[PDB]
Amino acid sequence: TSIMAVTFKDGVILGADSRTTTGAYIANRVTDKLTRVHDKIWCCRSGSAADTQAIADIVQYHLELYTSQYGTPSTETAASVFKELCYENKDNLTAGIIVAGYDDKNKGEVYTIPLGGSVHKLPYAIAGSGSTFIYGYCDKNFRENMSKEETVDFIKHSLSQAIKWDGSSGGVIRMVVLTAAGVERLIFYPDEYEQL
């Protein structure tokens, strides 16, 4: 798995590959690792599919009840719920989650909750087996306040590299754009990103 979230001028974008494996076998080649916990608060899942799915489902539930009572939740709050579940149940979970949401007051925000259950707010974050291979690349090409098109390009290239080197990653590259304008789903096929 290779997933990442990048904040930019107009909000934030989440991207991911679509390969889930059980050993060397590709159990699913069109997986959708971009999960919605709220209208404009999404996340990228890595680690145990069973664990991250259960986590996300619980979070979505919490943000839904929260909204019923106190209105739309901040991305910081969504990241707090994930953390609460990941930290408190660290002994029985294998989950690495990237949380990314778009608020009107805070624009785009990205939080990363690694294995321990710690929380880290960042300009952008990369994770998943394939991420190790793009640390150098991403550090060298990331710029704050990029344009939607520039950001989509950054994520598209970074992941194409992750997919290129990590066998646990592959398939299509999925993206989710979160801005005041709304929510946009993007997809990119091998034939395109493989030749970048």
Binding site: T20, Y25, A27, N28, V30, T31, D32, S48, A49, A50, Q53, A54
Partner: peptide, 20 residues
């Protein structure tokens, strides 16, 4: 659905030793 509780969606799926 898998024993640990993860779920998948798709147009064609196969499971079991004959899976492959």
């Amino acid at each position: 659905i898998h024993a640990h509780g993860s779920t998948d969606v798709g147009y064609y799926l196969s499971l079991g030793s004959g899976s492959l």
